[PDB]
């Protein structure tokens, strides 16, 4: 078929004898051979626009300040916690002793075991930083 030749950013135009036509505004085609361009994702509500939509790529969403993206292609907005905390059902809770979190997102991780590498502990870990091992 002649449609297969139409590249990303265009669609095989059924209204004009299968010519390649540029994608209309608010639409994209990140692949070739499409007969229609896909509608761009609207980054609104809890979502905010990070990368605007173009004929060759979909709009990429971000979250509202105090929140971070969850899942593939920013499908959800998860609440930010402080460094040295993690998110639970009852909100942000400090890392338990022996665990840390150097990020405003994610869970508390136990400190690295220096003794495993035959290394000494030079600086003990905290709630926000991992242990610093010797040489």
């Amino acid at each position, epitope marked *: 078929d002649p449609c297969s030749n139409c590249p990303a*950013g265009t669609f095989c135009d059924n209204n004009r004898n299968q*010519i390649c036509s540029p994608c209309p505004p608010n639409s994209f085609s990140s692949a070739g051979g499409q007969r229609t361009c896909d509608i761009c994702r609207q980054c609104k509500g809890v979502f905010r626009t990070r990368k605007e939509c*173009s004929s060759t790529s979909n709009a990429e969403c971000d979250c509202t300040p105090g929140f971070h993206c969850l899942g593939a292609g920013c499908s959800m907005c998860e609440q930010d916690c402080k460094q040295g905390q993690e998110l639970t059902k009852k909100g942000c809770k400090d890392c338990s002793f022996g665990t840390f979190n150097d990020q405003k997102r994610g869970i508390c991780r136990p400190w690295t075991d220096c003794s495993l590498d035959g290394k000494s502990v030079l600086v003990q870990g905290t709630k926000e930083r991992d242990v610093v091992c010797g040489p």
Partner: antibody, heavy 121, light 108 residues
Framework: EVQLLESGGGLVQPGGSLRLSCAASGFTFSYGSMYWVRQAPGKGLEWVSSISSGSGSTYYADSVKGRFTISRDNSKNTLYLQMNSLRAEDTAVYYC??????????????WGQGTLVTVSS | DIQMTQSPSSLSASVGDRVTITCRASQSISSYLNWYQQKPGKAPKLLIYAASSLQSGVPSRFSGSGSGTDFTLTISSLQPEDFATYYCQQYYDNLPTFGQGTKLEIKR
């Protein structure tokens, strides 16, 4: 504010080459097309070349096909027209243009001021 | 290729008069037809798109008609500012051919 500015126009000897530039501002070339349209003194508008956004798919009028090349340097937001094997019939004001989307298709809406190309010895 | 034949090449008509400009395509172009107005020293201005759709900011005196091969531009009541060269342009095949133009003189 959408602004288009052509440069590179001037006197050129028949058989020669000339490269036109069209500097754009006030928009991102993420949708539609950009064009080159020429006008011979006292004659009608002649569409010569098109370039699609994203892909950079090009189209040429039969009158310039094989001699002229349209290209876009997005990093510099500059549209080019490389014009080879020029003859007296190529003498014209050369305009770069930008599309707008009306009634389910892209068509010429914005025009630059033009650059005069004279093919003479 | 797609050829665009405009009729007539030129015409003279008085302020208040009604004029019609023809545009014929060598093959069917559905409604993918534009009308532009070119005044001396000014960039061409889009008057009509999709054969009959009047562009916003364009007076109701300018009107379009047609589908396929035969197209018509009419100006219902000419003004002195209407002096220009009118061009049709087809957008059916990625090679947007302009009509040869119609030069409109205002009679006085």
């Amino acid at each position: 504010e959408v602004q288009l500015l052509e440069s590179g126009g001037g006197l050129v000897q028949p058989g020669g080459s000339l490269r036109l530039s069209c500097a754009a501002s006030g928009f991102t070339f993420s949708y539609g097309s950009m064009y080159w349209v020429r006008q011979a003194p006292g004659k009608g508008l002649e569409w010569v070349s098109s370039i699609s956004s994203g892909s950079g798919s090009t189209y040429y009028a039969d009158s310039v096909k094989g001699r002229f090349t349209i290209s876009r340097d997005n990093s510099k937001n500059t549209l080019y027209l490389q014009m080879n094997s020029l003859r007296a019939e190529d003498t014209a004001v050369y305009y770069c243009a930008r599309s707008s989307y009306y009634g389910s298709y892209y068509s010429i809406d914005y025009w630059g001021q033009g650059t005069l190309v004279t093919v003479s010895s | 290729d797609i050829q665009m034949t405009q009729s007539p090449s030129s015409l003279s008509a008085s302020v208040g008069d009604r004029v019609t400009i023809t545009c014929r395509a060598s093959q069917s172009i559905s409604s993918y037809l534009n009308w532009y107005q070119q005044k001396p020293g000014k960039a061409p201005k889009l008057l009509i798109y999709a054969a009959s759709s009047l562009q916003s900011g364009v007076p109701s005196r300018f009107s379009g008609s047609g589908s396929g091969t035969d197209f018509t531009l009419t100006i219902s009541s000419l003004q002195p500012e209407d002096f220009a060269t009118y061009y049709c342009q087809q957008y059916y095949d990625n090679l947007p051919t302009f009509g040869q133009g119609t030069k409109l003189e205002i009679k006085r």
